[PDB]
Design an enzyme around this catalytic site. Structure first.
Site, PDB file in Angstrom:
ATOM      1  N   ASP D  58       0.833  -1.193   0.000  1.00 59.19           N
ATOM      2  CA  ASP D  58       0.000   0.000   0.000  1.00 59.19           C
ATOM      3  C   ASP D  58       0.871   1.246   0.000  1.00 59.19           C
ATOM      4  OD1 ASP D  58      -1.536   2.292   1.331  1.00 59.19           O
ATOM      5  OD2 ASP D  58      -3.142   0.829   1.053  1.00 59.19           O
ATOM      6  N   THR D  91      -3.128   6.274  -3.610  1.00 61.95           N
ATOM      7  CA  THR D  91      -1.996   6.945  -2.979  1.00 61.95           C
ATOM      8  C   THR D  91      -0.709   6.741  -3.772  1.00 61.95           C
ATOM      9  OG1 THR D  91      -1.587   5.035  -1.566  1.00 61.95           O
ATOM     10  CG2 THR D  91      -3.085   6.715  -0.750  1.00 61.95           C
ATOM     11  N   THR D  92      -0.445   5.510  -4.210  1.00 62.29           N
ATOM     12  CA  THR D  92       0.754   5.252  -5.000  1.00 62.29           C
ATOM     13  C   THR D  92       0.716   6.028  -6.308  1.00 62.29           C
ATOM     14  OG1 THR D  92       1.087   3.063  -4.033  1.00 62.29           O
ATOM     15  CG2 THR D  92       2.081   3.493  -6.173  1.00 62.29           C
ATOM     16  N   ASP D 392      -9.300  -1.116   1.747  1.00 60.91           N
ATOM     17  CA  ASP D 392      -9.245  -0.568   0.395  1.00 60.91           C
ATOM     18  C   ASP D 392     -10.403  -1.077  -0.455  1.00 60.91           C
ATOM     19  OD1 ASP D 392      -7.020   1.028   0.811  1.00 60.91           O
ATOM     20  OD2 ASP D 392      -5.601  -0.514   0.182  1.00 60.91           O
TER      21      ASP D 392
HETATM   22  N1  LIG Z   1      -5.690  -6.916 -13.673  1.00 58.18           N
HETATM   23  C1  LIG Z   1      -5.155  -5.744 -14.083  1.00 58.18           C
HETATM   24  N2  LIG Z   1      -4.664  -5.596 -15.330  1.00 58.18           N
HETATM   25  C2  LIG Z   1      -4.131  -4.433 -15.744  1.00 58.18           C
HETATM   26  N3  LIG Z   1      -4.044  -3.339 -14.974  1.00 58.18           N
HETATM   27  C3  LIG Z   1      -4.501  -3.349 -13.704  1.00 58.18           C
HETATM   28  C4  LIG Z   1      -5.093  -4.581 -13.177  1.00 58.18           C
HETATM   29  N4  LIG Z   1      -5.460  -4.323 -11.913  1.00 58.18           N
HETATM   30  C5  LIG Z   1      -5.128  -3.037 -11.650  1.00 58.18           C
HETATM   31  N5  LIG Z   1      -4.558  -2.460 -12.716  1.00 58.18           N
HETATM   32  C6  LIG Z   1      -4.077  -1.065 -12.770  1.00 58.18           C
HETATM   33  O1  LIG Z   1      -3.016  -0.938 -11.833  1.00 58.18           O
HETATM   34  C7  LIG Z   1      -3.216   0.177 -10.973  1.00 58.18           C
HETATM   35  C8  LIG Z   1      -3.095  -0.306  -9.538  1.00 58.18           C
HETATM   36  O2  LIG Z   1      -2.791   0.787  -8.689  1.00 58.18           O
HETATM   37  P1  LIG Z   1      -2.649   0.525  -7.116  1.00 58.18           P
HETATM   38  O3  LIG Z   1      -1.478  -0.397  -6.897  1.00 58.18           O
HETATM   39  O4  LIG Z   1      -4.015   0.163  -6.594  1.00 58.18           O
HETATM   40  O5  LIG Z   1      -2.269   1.991  -6.594  1.00 58.18           O
HETATM   41  P2  LIG Z   1      -3.124   2.645  -5.411  1.00 58.18           P
HETATM   42  O6  LIG Z   1      -3.112   1.611  -4.320  1.00 58.18           O
HETATM   43  O7  LIG Z   1      -2.363   3.898  -5.077  1.00 58.18           O
HETATM   44  O8  LIG Z   1      -4.467   2.869  -6.054  1.00 58.18           O
HETATM   45  C9  LIG Z   1      -4.590   0.746 -11.256  1.00 58.18           C
HETATM   46  O9  LIG Z   1      -4.441   2.081 -11.735  1.00 58.18           O
HETATM   47  C10 LIG Z   1      -5.181  -0.116 -12.349  1.00 58.18           C
HETATM   48  O10 LIG Z   1      -5.560   0.709 -13.450  1.00 58.18           O
END
Ligand SMILES: Nc1ncnc2c1ncn2[C@@H]1O[C@H](COP(=O)(O)OP(=O)(O)O)[C@@H](O)[C@H]1O
Ligand SMILES: Nc1ncnc2c1ncn2[C@@H]1O[C@H](COP(=O)(O)OP(=O)(O)O)[C@@H](O)[C@H]1O
Ligand SMILES: Nc1ncnc2c1ncn2[C@@H]1O[C@H](COP(=O)(O)OP(=O)(O)O)[C@@H](O)[C@H]1O
Ligand SMILES: [Mg+2]
Ligand SMILES: [Mg+2]
Ligand SMILES: [Mg+2]
Lengths: 527, 48, 533, 525
Positions: D58, D91-92, D392
Site C-alpha cells: 500500500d 496513494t501510489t 481498500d
Molecule cells: N488486472 C489488471 N490488469 C491491468 N491493470 C490493472 C489490473 N489491476 C489493476 N490495474 C491497474 O493498476 C493500478 C493499480 O494501482 P494501485 O497499486 O491500486 O495503486 P493505489 O493503491 O495507489 O491505487 C490501477 O491504476 C489499475 O488501473
C-alpha cells in the site's frame, strides 16, 4: 549490504542506478557552475586561496583547478579538461559543458528504462557523423595577419576586457609572426612572458628582443650601451674548488700571499680571454660588450670586467641561452677555449630598468630576432596572472590556427549545423541508437543555449530563431551576443580552431561513453 | 515592511552627512501628514 | 521535516570549510559594503585636520600616524575586496608617493554609488562602461585645470613653497620648518643632470631634543664609533675597502706547515712585518681615514693606531656603497694602497655625541654632494617615525615635480571642478550611461566632504558654496581650513597646490580598482586553514 | 544569505536550490514507490524499532513507514494521507503523478523557462483533463458483477490472487448487506474482527457480529440456539453514592442488615431483567442474551446465571448500534420501561475459545443491517495486510456505489487523457503549451510503471498502446500478462471515477504549489 561491504565493512559503494545518479549529479553541478564562463559576456569569478591569494579568472581549466571539490567524477572531468588545455590550449569550458549535457541527455532516456549501451552506440555513430560534417564545414585558408588577428580577438575577448583584448591581439599576433619560421613547427618556448608591476594593464606590449629579470651586480657598470656585442656563455667566472680536496700548505706569510694571488689564475685566464676579445672587437668607446652568463661571477671577475667597460649578467635562465642565440644571433659557449668575433651576438640597444628592488635588462633593436618577449604590465598581481593566462590562450589559438590552414566559424554556428546534420542522418542509424544520436545532437546544441543565456536573451526562442535561419538559408549562422539575432560568424570574424573542435568531440564523447558504462563505484583500499 | 526598510535606508544617507536624527524625524512627520492628506484627496467613494 | 538538505550538485561537492557567494546580494553588495567600511576606517585621517591613529600590529609594535598607506599596511585586512582596494592604494604609493587616502576615499565613494545605481535598476556592465567613459573624460579635463608650474627646482624658497602643501597634511602645525629642511636636502641633491634619486636622501633619527632642533647635513651619519684612537680628521682622505682589514687568506684551506724550528720562530714575526708593511703602504698615500666593510684584526688596528689612521667599520654593504657615493671613493677588494682616483675626499670626519648616541660624521663644507642626510630630533620614537614619513612624502613630491612640473589647485577645488564638468558632460550624453557618469562626478564630492568633516564644519554648506563659486567661474577656490564657519578661499594665491601627476595617477588607480571590484560576480573562498605569513 | 545574517543557525535553500531540493525529494519518493503499482508489484518488509514486521505494498502505509525527514516528503505524505482518508485508494498513483509532474516541469525549467508558465499550462491541462474524464466515464447500474469487478481490481493489486478472490466475495456481500437503498453507506456498521488461528483463505463474512469478549461466569451456557438479545447500557455492578455516604452501625447484626440492604439498587434492575426474561420465554427452549456496555459484578452474574441467562459485559460502544441494526432490538440506557418489544432476536449465539481469548458469535439474524468480516491468518502481519486490503476494497465498492459511474483502468484512461491533451495543446496560447505537454507526459506515467512492473519495456509498450488507441479510439490499457493493448472495460479492470478526479485535482494543486516555492527556510530557533 553489498559484497564489498561484506568483505570490507568500512567501504563506500554505489551500485546500479546509484552510480549513474552520482556521476550525473557531479557532471550537472560542474556544468551549472561553468555555464557562466562561456562567451565574452560571461561573468568573472574570484578565487581566494587558503593563504589568501586573490585570483580573478574566467578560464575553465583555471577555475576547475581552484575548485573546492573532492568528487570522483569531478576529478575525471578535471583530468580531461587538463589534457585539453595541455594540447590545444582552449575549449575547457566547452569541454565541461558538452560532457555535462551529454550525460544529462543520456539520463533523459536511461531513466525511461533504456540501457546505457544503446545510448553509447548512438553516441559513437553520431560522433562519426559529426566529425565528417566538421571536415566538410571547415574553411581552409592561407592565414595572413588579418585572420590571425580575428582568431586572437575571438579568444582574448572571451578571456579579458575588450580594450585589453584589443591590445593583446596585436601583441600576440606580432610575436607569433616574428618567431614563426617558414614551414616549421612553432616553438612557443621562444616567446618569453615577463611580468612587470608598475604601469597600467593596457601598457603591456611586445619587445622585438629579450628582457631579463636581473641586472648587472656591479654599481660601476654602464646602465645603458647603445651599440652592443652580446656574448652568451655557460662558463663559471667565479671561484671553483678543486674536485680532489687540494688544501694549501705554506710556511710563511709571504708564501701565503703568493698562494692567494696564484689561486685565482685559472679564472683570471678566462677573464683576460674575454678582455682580449673585447679589445680586439671594439677599439673605441662607441660599442660595448654585454656578457650574459648562465653561471655565477665572483666580485673579483666583476671588477675586472667593469674596469674594461664591460657589462656582465650572471645566473641567467637556461632557456635564455637559446633565446639570446636566436634573437641576438651569437653562439652559446660552454668554454672559452676558441672564441672568435664570429660567435658574438649583436643588439642595437641594451639598457637597465629599475623597478623597486628588482632590476630588468632590456636587449632590443636586434637585426631580425627569432625570439621575442611579451612584457606584461599591470597594477596588481592578480591582473598580471589574468593577463598571463589570457596571453597563453591567445598564443595557443594563433599557433593552432597556423598549424592547419583551416578555421571553423564560431558563435555556436558549427554546433547548430552539426546538430541539424545529425538530426538529418538519424533515420539512417538502425535500431534504438537513434535515441543516442538525438541525445548527442541535443547535447551539441548546448553551446548556443549557454551563449544566448549569458547574453541575457531568451534561450529557447533564440535557439529556434538560429535553427530556422540556418535551415531556410543553409548558412553557418551563430548567436549575435548583442542583439540575439542570427549572424554569419564567418563574415563578422568569429573564428574557432578546427583542432579545438575535433578534440572537443573526441574527448567529450570518449569520457561520456566511459562514464555512462560505469555501474559501480568502490572505495575499499583502506585497512 | 518594504516601505519601512526603504525609509530607513534613505535616512541612513542623511545620518552619514552630519544631520541630527531629530531633523530627519521632523521631516518624516511632515511627509506623513502630507501623505495622509494626498491619499484622502485622491480617494474615490464606493457604494457597498 | 526539520532540516533543509544541501542542494544537489556543486553545493554538496563543496569542501568542508569553503564558502561560495554568488549573485548580486551575496557577492557584489557584500564587496561594496566591505570597501565602504574600509574607506570609513581611513576617512578621518584625511587632510590637514586628519587625526593620527594608534595601530598595534600582530607583533606588538605601535604605529601612530595619519598616512593612509601605512595604516592599511599595518591593518590585518581579511576581506578580499578590501584587499584589492588596499593593493590599489599601495600601487598609488609606489608610483607617486602621495594620494593613498584619496585613492581609498574615491574608490569607496565610487563603489557606494555603484551599489546605488545597481539598486535603482542599472546593470553592472552599464555602470562599468559609464565609469570608464567618465574616467576618460576626467583624464581629458585634468590638463586644463593646471594653474601653475614649478618653473624652478634649484631655488630653496620656491621648492620649500611647493613642498609645503605636501607635508601640510601630515604635521599640520609645524610644516614651514620641515618644508625648509626637505627643500635644502633636495636642493643639495639633484645635480645639473635631470635625474633625481630618492635614496640619496638619508634620515637619521637621534632622540631627545625636540623636532624643532632637526638639521640637514651634507654627508652621512653613522650611529657607531671609531675602532682606533684617532677620532677627528680635518682634511679627510678616506680609503674604502670592501674586504676585512686583515691579512688576506686562502679560499680552499690554509694550514701553516712547519718543518724546522727556525720557521716556527720566524712565522709570527714575518706575518706581523707583512701586516705592518701593508698598513704603512696604505698610509704613505696620504690616506688618514680607512673604512672597511669587514672585521678589523688586532695587529692591523695596532699598526693603524701607530700611523694615526682613523678606522670606521661599516656593517652593511648598503652603507658602504652610500659612503663611497657621498665621498667619491672606490671600494677596493684587497689591501692595496689606493690610487689617486680611488681615494675619497671629505671636508671633515669626526666622532661626536648627539643626545646619548655616539655618531661618526662625514661632513662636506660645500653645498653639494651625491648624498645628503637629515638628522631628525624628537622626544619620542613614534614622533620621529611620523616625521620621517612626512619627509618621505615631501621627497616623493619633489621627485614627482622633477618628473612633471604641472600643479593643480588643492583643497578640493580640483575635485569640485572635475565634478562640475563631468556632470555637465553627462547631461548631454543620452542613454543609460548618463546615470553612471553623473554618479562618477558626484563621487568627487567625497574629497571636499571629508575635508569639511575633518575641519569640523558642515560639509553640505561647503559643497554648496564651492558649486556656487565655481559657477561664477572661479575654478581655483577651495575650502578654508582656518575658519570656524563654512568658508572658501582662492587656493592659487594661498599656495595650497598638489601635483597634477599625483591626481592623474590616483584617479586612474581608484577607477581601475572600483571597476575591477564591480567585475567580480562569484566568490569561491577556500578553507582559511593556516598561513601565518 | 539575508536570513543567515539575522539567525546564524539557520538553514536556507534559495532560488534554483529550492527547486532542486524539492524535485530531488519527489524523485526519491517516486523511485521508492514505483514498484508498488499494479498487481505485479513487489512486497515490502517494514521492520519497526521494536521489531514489529509489516508486509505491504500500500502506498500510504509504505509512505508512513519509511524513515524520511524531508519537507517535500512530508507534504506529499500529507497529500496521500488526505487521498487515503477520503477515497481510500490511489496513494501510489498520487505520489507517482506528483513526482512525474515535477520531473517534466523541471525538464523545461532547466532550459530557462519560468515556473509560472508551467503552472499556467498545468491549470489549462487540468481543466481539459477533467472535461475529458467527464466525457469518458461509464455510467452503469451497480449490480453484483460490476461491484465484484471493482473489488477484484483493488484487492488483486493489494494481496495474493486467491486471497483477493475470497476477499472480493466477502467485501461485496458485506456492502450489499449493510446498504439501504437511497442512503449514504455507513462503513462503521461493518465490524472488522481478526482471529489468528487458521489459514488466510478462511476469512469470511458473518451475517451478524463477532465480539472479542465472552461470558465471564463459567456456569452460563456456551451455546444458545434461539435467543432474545437485550442490548443495554446499564451498570450492573455495585455503585458508590456520589455524596460520600458511608455506613454507621452498632452491632454485627446491623452490619449484616446494611450489607444485605446495600445491594438492593442493583438487585432491583437484575430482578427486572429476570422478570422480563421469564415473561418472554416461559420454557427452556428459547434463550436470553444480555450484552451490556457497562460492567457486571459477580453477584449479578451469578443471579443471572441462576436463571439461565448469558450476560456479556464491557461491550464496545459501536456494538450498541451494530446490535440494534443487526438483531433488531433497541439499546437501553435504563430499565424504567422495558417491554418484550425492546428485545432483538438472533437465530444462533455461541462462544468460541481461542487460546486465552474468547469470542462470541451472533449469527442467523433475520435481516442484518450490520455484519462483520472475520480476518483469519497464521501471523500478525498477515492479519494487518488483510485488514488494509479489505479497507481498500470496502472503500472502492462504496465509491463505486456512491456515483453510478466507473472509469476503465489498466492505464487506458491516462493514455486517452494524454492524447486528448496533446490534441488540445495548440488551442492554448502563449508558452503554456509546454506546461500542457509536461502534464500529458506526467499523466502517461501509469502505463509506463505498469509496463515496468509487468517486466516489459516502456517505450515499445507505450507506443503500441498509443497507436492502438489512435487507430481504434477505444479505451485500451496495458495487459500485464502479454504487454499488448487491451480494452479495460471488456475484461473488467475498473477504476473509481472519484479516485481519478481526486488524483487530478490534488496532484495538480500540490505540483503547482511546489513549483512556485523559491525558498526553503528553517529559522524558528
Ligand atoms: N488486472 C489488471 N490488469 C491491468 N491493470 C490493472 C489490473 N489491476 C489493476 N490495474 C491497474 O493498476 C493500478 C493499480 O494501482 P494501485 O497499486 O491500486 O495503486 P493505489 O493503491 O495507489 O491505487 C490501477 O491504476 C489499475 O488501473
Ligand atoms: N564576439 C563573439 N560573438 C559571438 N560568439 C562568440 C564571440 N566570441 C566568442 N564567441 C563564442 O563563444 C565561445 C567562447 O568560449 P570560451 O568562453 O572561450 O570557452 P573555452 O574557454 O572553453 O574555449 C566560442 O565557442 C565562440 O564560438
Ligand atoms: N592648507 C590646506 N588647506 C586646505 N586643504 C589642504 C591644505 N593642505 C592640504 N590640503 C588638502 O589635503 C589633501 C591631502 O590629504 P592627505 O592627508 O595628504 O591624503 P593623501 O596623503 O592621500 O594625499 C589634498 O587634497 C589637499 O588639497
Ligand atoms: Mg576559449
Ligand atoms: Mg598626501
Ligand atoms: Mg490501489
Amino acid at each position: 549490504m553489498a559484497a564489498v561491504k561484506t568483505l570490507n565493512p568500512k567501504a563506500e559503494v554505489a551500485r546500479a542506478q546509484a552510480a549513474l545518479a552520482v556521476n550525473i549529479s557531479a557532471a550537472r553541478g560542474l556544468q551549472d557552475v561553468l555555464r557562466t564562463n562561456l562567451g565574452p559576456k560571461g561573468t568573472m569569478k574570484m578565487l581566494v586561496s587558503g593563504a589568501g591569494d586573490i585570483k580573478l579568472t574566467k578560464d575553465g581549466n583555471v577555475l576547475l583547478h581552484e575548485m573546492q571539490i573532492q568528487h570522483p567524477t569531478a576529478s575525471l572531468i578535471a583530468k580531461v579538461a587538463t589534457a585539453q588545455d595541455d594540447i590545444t590550449g582552449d575549449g575547457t569550458t566547452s569541454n565541461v559543458l558538452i560532457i555535462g549535457e551529454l550525460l544529462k541527455q543520456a539520463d533523459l532516456y536511461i531513466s525511461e528504462g533504456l540501457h546505457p549501451r544503446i545510448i553509447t552506440e548512438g553516441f559513437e555513430a553520431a560522433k562519426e557523423k559529426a566529425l565528417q560534417f566538421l571536415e566538410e564545414v571547415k574553411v581552409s585558408r592561407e592565414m595572413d595577419r588579418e585572420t590571425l588577428i580575428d582568431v586572437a580577438r575571438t579568444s582574448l575577448r572571451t578571456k579579458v576586457h575588450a580594450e585589453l583584448a584589443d591590445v593583446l591581439t596585436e601583441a600576440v599576433v606580432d610575436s607569433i609572426l616574428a618567431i614563426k619560421k617558414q614551414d616549421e613547427p612553432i616553438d612557443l618556448f621562444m616567446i618569453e612572458i615577463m611580468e612587470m608591476k608598475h604601469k597600467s594593464e593596457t601598457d603591456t606590449s611586445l619587445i622585438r628582443g629579450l628582457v631579463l629579470d636581473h641586472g648587472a651586480r656591479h654599481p660601476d657598470m654602464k646602465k645603458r650601451v647603445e651599440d652592443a656585442y652580446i656574448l652568451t656563455c655557460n662558463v663559471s667566472l667565479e671561484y671553483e674548488k678543486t674536485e680532489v680536496n687540494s688544501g694549501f700548505f705554506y710556511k710563511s706569510a709571504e708564501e701565503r700571499e703568493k698562494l692567494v694571488k696564484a689561486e685565482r689564475k685559472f679564472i683570471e685566464d678566462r677573464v683576460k680571454k674575454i678582455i682580449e676579445l673585447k679589445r680586439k672587437v671594439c677599439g673605441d668607446s662607441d660599442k660595448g660588450f654585454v656578457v650574459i652568463n648562465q653561471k655565477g661571477i665572483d666580485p673579483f671577475s666583476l671588477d675586472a670586467l667593469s674596469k674594461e667597460g664591460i657589462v656582465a649578467l650572471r645566473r641567467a635562465k637556461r632557456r635564455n641561452m637559446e633565446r639570446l642565440t636566436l634573437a641576438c644571433g651569437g653562439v652559446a659557449l660552454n668554454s672559452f677555449d676558441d672564441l672568435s668575433p664570429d660567435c658574438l651576438g649583436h643588439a642595437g640597444l641594451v639598457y637597465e630598468y629599475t623597478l623597486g628592488e628588482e632590476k630588468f635588462t632590456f636587449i632590443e633593436k636586434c637585426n631580425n630576432p627569432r625570439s621575442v618577449t611579451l612584457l606584461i604590465k599591470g597594477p596588481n598581481k592578480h591582473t598580471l596572472t589574468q593577463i598571463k593566462d589570457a596571453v597563453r590562450d591567445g598564443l595557443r589559438a594563433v599557433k593552432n590556427a597556423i598549424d592547419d590552414g583551416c578555421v571553423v566559424p564560431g558563435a555556436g554556428a558549427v554546433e547548430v549545423a552539426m546538430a541539424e546534420a545529425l538530426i538529418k542522418h538519424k533515420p539512417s542509424v538502425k535500431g534504438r541508437a537513434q535515441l543516442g544520436v538525438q541525445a548527442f545532437a541535443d547535447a551539441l546544441l548546448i553551446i548556443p543555449k549557454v551563449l544566448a543565456q549569458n547574453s541575457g536573451f531568451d534561450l529557447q526562442e533564440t535557439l529556434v530563431k538560429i535553427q530556422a535561419e540556418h535551415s531556410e538559408s543553409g548558412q553557418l549562422v551563430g548567436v549575435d551576443l548583442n542583439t540575439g539575432e542570427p549572424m554569419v560568424a564567418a563574415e563578422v570574424g568569429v573564428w574557432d580552431n578546427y583542432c579545438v573542435k575535433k578534440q572537443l568531440l573526441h574527448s567529450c564523447t570518449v569520457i561520456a561513453t566511459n562514464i555512462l558504462l560505469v555501474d559501480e563505484i568502490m572505495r575499499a583500499g583502506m585497512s | 515592511i518594504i516601505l519601512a526598510g526603504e525609509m530607513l535606508s534613505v535616512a541612513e544617507h542623511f545620518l552619514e552627512q552630519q544631520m541630527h536624527p531629530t531633523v530627519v524625524i521632523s521631516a518624516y512627520r511632515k511627509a506623513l501628514d502630507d501623505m495622509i492628506s494626498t491619499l484622502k484627496k485622491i480617494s474615490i467613494p464606493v457604494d457597498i | 521535516a526539520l532540516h533543509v538538505p544541501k542542494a544537489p550538485g556543486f553545493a554538496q561537492m563543496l569542501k568542508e570549510g569553503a564558502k561560495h557567494f554568488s549573485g548580486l546580494e551575496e557577492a557584489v553588495y557584500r564587496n561594496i559594503q566591505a570597501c565602504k567600511e574600509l574607506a570609513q576606517t581611513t576617512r578621518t585621517a584625511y587632510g590637514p585636520n586628519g587625526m593620527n591613529k594608534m595601530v598595534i600590529n600582530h607583533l606588538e609594535k605601535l604605529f601612530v600616524t595619519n598616512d593612509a598607506a601605512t595604516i592599511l599596511r599595518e591593518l590585518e585586512v581579511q576581506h578580499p575586496a578590501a584587499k584589492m582596494i588596499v593593493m590599489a592604494s599601495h600601487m598609488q604609493e609606489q608610483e607617486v608617493g602621495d594620494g593613498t587616502n584619496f585613492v581609498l576615499v574615491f574608490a569607496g565613494a565610487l563603489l557606494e554609488l555603484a551599489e546605488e545605481l545597481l539598486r535603482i535598476g542599472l546593470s553592472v556592465s552599464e555602470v562599468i562602461e559609464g565609469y570608464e567613459i567618465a574616467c576618460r573624460k576626467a583624464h581629458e579635463i585634468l590638463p586644463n585645470l593646471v594653474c601653475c608650474s614649478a618653473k624652478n627646482l634649484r631655488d630653496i624658497d620656491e621648492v620649500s613653497s611647493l613642498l609645503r602643501t605636501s607635508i601640510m597634511s601630515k604635521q599640520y602645525g609645524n610644516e614651514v620648518f620641515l618644508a625648509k629642511l626637505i627643500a635644502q636636502a633636495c636642493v643639495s641633491i639633484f645635480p645639473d643632470s635631470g635625474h633625481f634619486n630618492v635614496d640619496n636622501i638619508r634620515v637619521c633619527k637621534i632622540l631627545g631634543s625636540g623636532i624643532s632642533s632637526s638639521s640637514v647635513l651634507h654627508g652621512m651619519v653613522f650611529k657607531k664609533e671609531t675602532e682606533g684612537d684617532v677620532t677627528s680628521v680635518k682634511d679627510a682622505k678616506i680609503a674604502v675597502y670592501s674586504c676585512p682589514f686583515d691579512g688576506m687568506i686562502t679560499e680552499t684551506k690554509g694550514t701553516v706547515l712547519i718543518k724546522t724550528a727556525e720557521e716556527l720562530m720566524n712565522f709570527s714575526k714575518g706575518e706581523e712585518n707583512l701586516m705592518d708593511a701593508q698598513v704603512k703602504a696604505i698610509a704613505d698615500t696620504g690616506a688618514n681615514v680607512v673604512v672597511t666593510g669587514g672585521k678589523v684584526a688586532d695587529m692591523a688596528l695596532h699598526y693603524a693606531n701607530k700611523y694615526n689612521i682613523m678606522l670606521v667599520r661599516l656593517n652593511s654593504k648598503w652603507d658602504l656603497r652610500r659612503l663611497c657615493k657621498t665621498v667619491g671613493a672606490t671600494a677596493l677588494p684587497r689591501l692595496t694602497p689606493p690610487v689617486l682616483e680611488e681615494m675619497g675626499h671629505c671636508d671633515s670626519v669626526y666622532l661626536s655625541e648627539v643626545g646619548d648616541t655616539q655618531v661618526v660624521v662625514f661632513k662636506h663644507e660645500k653645498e653639494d654632494g651625491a648624498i645628503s642626510t637629515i638628522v631628525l630630533r624628537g622626544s619620542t620614537d613614534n614622533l620621529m617615525d611620523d616625521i620621517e614619513r612626512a619627509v618621505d612624502d615631501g621627497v616623493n613630491t619633489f621627485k614627482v615635480l622633477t618628473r612633471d612640473k604641472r600643479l593643480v589647485p588643492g583643497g578640493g577645488a580640483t575635485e569640485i571642478e572635475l565634478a562640475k564638468q563631468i556632470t555637465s558632460y553627462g547631461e548631454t550624453c543620452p542613454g543609460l550611461e548618463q546615470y553612471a557618469i553623473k554618479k562618477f562626478a558626484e563621487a568627487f564630492e567625497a574629497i571636499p566632504r571629508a575635508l569639511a568633516e575633518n575641519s569640523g564644519v558642515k560639509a553640505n554648506e561647503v559643497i554648496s558654496k564651492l558649486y556656487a563659486v565655481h559657477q561664477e567661474g572661479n575654478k581655483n577656490v577651495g575650502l578654508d581650513i582656518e575658519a570656524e564657519v563654512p568658508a572658501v578661499k582662492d587656493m592659487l594665491e594661498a599656495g595650497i597646490l598638489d601635483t597634477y601627476l599625483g591626481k592623474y595617477w590616483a584617479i586612474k588607480l581608484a577607477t581601475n580598482a572600483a571597476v575591477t571590484v564591480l567585475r567580480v560576480d562569484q566568490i569561491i573562498m577556500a578553507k582559511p586553514a593556516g598561513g601565518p605569513k
